[PDB]
Amino acid sequence: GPPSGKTYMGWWGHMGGPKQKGITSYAVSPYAQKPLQGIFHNAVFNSFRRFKSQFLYVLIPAGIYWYWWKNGNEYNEFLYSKAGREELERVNV
Amino acid sequence: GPPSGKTYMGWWGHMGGPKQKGITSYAVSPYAQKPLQGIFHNAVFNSFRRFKSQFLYVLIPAGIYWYWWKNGNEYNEFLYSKAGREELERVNV
């Protein structure tokens, strides 16, 4: 194995990060817990929070886009209708 | 990079070998020599030595094999000739 180029990742025991002191972790065996850890009840009060916190950032842009869609759509059905052939002969040439 | 499995090769400066002391090498630029370093003359006294030192180890086995080849070859041409159809009716069934 020749030299390797330095990066920002290493493997365990030299992962690359800064030198941890102070934190203390605790966990419990996946056997040692309720099957269905926390389902329904209060785990769903979040299925509306994970929603709220973001929806606008999608809806607002989806909105802008879906109304713009509907508009010229309507507008096209018109100028290709009877009631529209007028405007057509003008807009189109 | 995880642990690698030990072998019997490394790269330069850790090639794997034992710890050299005593030898001293010398060489000279490929520019600094006669084009046609040593051709013909006495470089061919070896094209008969590199031959001699081995030929037997090939010839002897090639021999055994080429005479064995020729033999049953002859033998086959016979038993499929006029002069042979006799022996055939016997050897073959």
Add this chain to the structure above:
Amino acid sequence: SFSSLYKTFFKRNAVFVGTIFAGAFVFQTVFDTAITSWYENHNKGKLWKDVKARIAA
């Protein structure tokens, strides 16, 4: 899934690779049994078998 009804067969170990394949082998017949039935029924009258029935030639 009830802790009694499971632990009976398997005590406190998972299924074993071969028992799996065994179940797989069985399941695969038991299933293609059911589903092909429920489907031939759901489409009763419609199957060429049901139509072969009435129709004569």
Add this chain to the structure above:
Amino acid sequence: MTAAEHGLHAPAYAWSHNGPFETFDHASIRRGYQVYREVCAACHSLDRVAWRTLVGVSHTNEEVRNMAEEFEYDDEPDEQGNPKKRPGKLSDYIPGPYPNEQAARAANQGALPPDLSLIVKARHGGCDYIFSLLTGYPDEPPAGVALPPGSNYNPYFPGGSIAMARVLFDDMVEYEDGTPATTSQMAKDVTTFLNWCAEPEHDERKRLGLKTVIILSSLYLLSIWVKKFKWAGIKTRKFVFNPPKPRK
């Protein structure tokens, strides 16, 4: 696009097979073949369908052997090197009306009647659009629409001018089972038969589809469960911070 160039949208009739659990109506298919045989065969090839393929679906082994041999396919030359005919086998593909592209057009004012074997997929809407173009030849080409010599009007075709004249006229087919040989019953069948023709695998395809999903769904839910289990230590994992005396 003018609604005339587009063609009128065929409506959502409620077919025997529509739905995830619905085999064709084989009785219906059986009818369509007759409606096929007596009516449209006059002009339309059905070349990618083979006699044997009918057996077990619309007919019975001889029933299709009978039909089969009513036609003389080409057959390997005698010992001399001269042609010969022979009846058909179940191994054969239902022969086209015409000997080539040309005579198909000669017999139709220069129109090339589409091979039907794949029609219910080579068109948008398909089953519906097939039904509707067949029960949608109205009496007269709408006020103002001026129709060319040898062309009919259909709202369901694009730009109405279809080179195929109407062909369903009640009862022209003698429905062997004894059903109202109407035009909306002559038609609904050849559609269900032509559906089959382009999608023979159909009833098995939803059969197997059934199995695939039931198993695959269960795996999905099963997989999920498993995941929360193996994650359970990381999910409910909980840290704490205690700053440390400054000496290093």
Add this chain to the structure above:
Amino acid sequence: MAFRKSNVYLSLVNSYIIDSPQPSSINYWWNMGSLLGLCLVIQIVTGIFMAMHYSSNIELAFSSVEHIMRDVHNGYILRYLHANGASFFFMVMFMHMAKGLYYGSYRSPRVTLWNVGVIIFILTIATAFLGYCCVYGQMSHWGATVITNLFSAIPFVGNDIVSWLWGGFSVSNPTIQRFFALHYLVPFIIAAMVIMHLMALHIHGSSNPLGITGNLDRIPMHSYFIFKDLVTVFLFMLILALFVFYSPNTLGHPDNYIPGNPLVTPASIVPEWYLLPFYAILRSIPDKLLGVITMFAAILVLLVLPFTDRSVVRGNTFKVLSKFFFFIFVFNFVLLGQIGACHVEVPYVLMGQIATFIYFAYFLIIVPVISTIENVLFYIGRVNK
């Protein structure tokens, strides 16, 4: 040490699939490359198995696929899987490329990682196109005419290139036959390339839905993500099962059950969906040479993204103004696609044009602007003076 670590072969297996240290925090978005490798495998298996009954001669071509449909045992399953799968390949790949924009994966040290995926994406379009030209229906013969013809756009030599590339006067027989052969070749090139793609991925490891450093809380891909990835997998197969058995053509164009005909283009030229947004962009340009260029540029521009992102953080996650336009971008891109389906009628053309602008402007203009602003909001939005 353990054997899986020690062995020449199993050490790779371990270090890319078992013992790999992943950020602890990554979510189901990251399951896409996994599901990407799964499609490529579905493509290659079902393809080969189908090729065994395929003929690439311009006559037998269209029929032989019908052969695979009507005759080969499970052959219809072979086709509907190949075809629907190619689509899911493309969806999943967009979602994979999405994820990379949103969390700003394209961003150093991961540039090469990113860049290579742009090469893959290119090769996947090249691949799937050829596989389409191999059905030889209507959409096929005319698809194959236009793509061959993009090369005329090349000054001078351009027509000849096309003639060559055709092997004759038209998209003819020496064409479908090379399109079959090149369809065989290329997927191995993707796989070749997926390997360098995974090598880049490997030396830096995955990012996170937080755009901070992973190196403080890693966990090993086995058994978490191996099991996590298994959830998206089955789900993937389910929807794919759904299409394949129930909606096999709810994703294809009926013009393609019509045998290709070199004299008569249809009058409904909708191309593949995953392709549409480019068809749109192409059309948007009333000039031939420029139009071509702009279509290709629609994909290349993806390479500036690490320079124009001016930010100081990777990720729209803590980025409101960034999120917002990011979904304008997504939604534009979908609209652009709707535009591709509709006729070159009004206002559609002009709508098409505007989206196209929005498209490139997002990489080239919105992003470096917004991100520079967003740096400055981050400063003054706290400090004293």
Add this chain to the structure above:
Amino acid sequence: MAFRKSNVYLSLVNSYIIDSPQPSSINYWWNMGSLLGLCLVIQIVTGIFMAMHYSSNIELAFSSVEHIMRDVHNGYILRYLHANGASFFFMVMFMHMAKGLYYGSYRSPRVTLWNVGVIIFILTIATAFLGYCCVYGQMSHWGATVITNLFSAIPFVGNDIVSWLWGGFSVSNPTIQRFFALHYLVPFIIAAMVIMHLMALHIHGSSNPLGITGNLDRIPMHSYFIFKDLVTVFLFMLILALFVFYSPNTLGHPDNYIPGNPLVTPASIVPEWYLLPFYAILRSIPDKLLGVITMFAAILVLLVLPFTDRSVVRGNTFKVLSKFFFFIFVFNFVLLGQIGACHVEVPYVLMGQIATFIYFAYFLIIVPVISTIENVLFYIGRVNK
């Protein structure tokens, strides 16, 4: 550090082709794997380029190759290169495998290295056979009958396997078509495998025509061997040029310009030369099941070679008794091949039988014997008491 070392991609390139530390002493024998990789590349390029004009339908098949011959521009060069090249592939590969026996490369730590090449060698026979079945001449249709039929030798299921594998009553059309498709697939498998083969090679590095440790006098593959390898390369192309333009069929069987015919086997069944020594071994056995087994065993037995070599040194180089039988082995193997060409006439059958014995006896008997003796000559041939 330098860039070629630092880059994710160029570091491999460097470490396997530029900066690799080779034993200083290795000779032109070692140029074989290099020249091996070169054939595999010649196979794949010319193959694809030919496939563009090939049809794998049992009708068009034989003709389409004539098409490639009579019509495609440089197409004859495409064929004669594909075909002659496959041969040179096989020669060079034997010489490569030779070299491995003689210098005892198969020998630890290089077992896996060795073993994998046995897999490659198997895949190359599988590959080239299928490529032959794709011409669909006489030798093709009957070659393809017998190999398909080797599977009947399998108890019970054996006939069915063959029926399956045929896709019908005989080597028919669903056969040549799968044989074409599998011919496409497999060479990528060889290449896949060449990579693991080169990985094994890499972690131990090459041996030497002295069977001692390299680690005291290494030099870097660039620029010595890169240039050394270039000498064997051109020379390789020269002889290949010679055949390709002047002796294009001095290596093929004329029965193959005859369109395959399922009713009539010829009466001169000579199979490919690189295959002959196995044809011989196969025939040597008057029992069907056993004969098959022994043919396959003729290749597998190659895997015991690191156990039966009992020696204490790698290499026939300092090994007189070893050299000697090593060339009996080579020469047997060639004779075995001559036997394959001749009719099952006398004494040929009995000669065939004896060679076959000599063959397996060399791995299984001569070698461990001789090498054990040779250990003991090495002891008493010096020491006092």
Add this chain to the structure above:
Amino acid sequence: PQSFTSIARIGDYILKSPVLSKLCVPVANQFINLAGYKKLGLKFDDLIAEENPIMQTALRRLPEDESYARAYRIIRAHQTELTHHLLPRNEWIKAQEDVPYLLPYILEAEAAAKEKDELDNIEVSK
């Protein structure tokens, strides 16, 4: 890679002008809220991308107990983020906390770099 030295220039200016400052900072304040990040115990200097030399001059330099601090937050971040939740409301970093603890060094180092860049290409007039 828009420069911090450059964000300083712009953001200092805006902070100084009582004109600008009154217009901008309300929004900026509104922004560094909508970000969500102080709800994952994150200070803003935590977020700064590190895979580049300057930040690695700037973390090698960052006082010990300060790095232990960073650390806990960064792990707390990930941990919570993966729990698909937000912290206990009273664990959130509070508006006075979100202080540019890192920014001097980043600036300290940026400065140092731009200097060396210059001093590598310093020309000469005779």
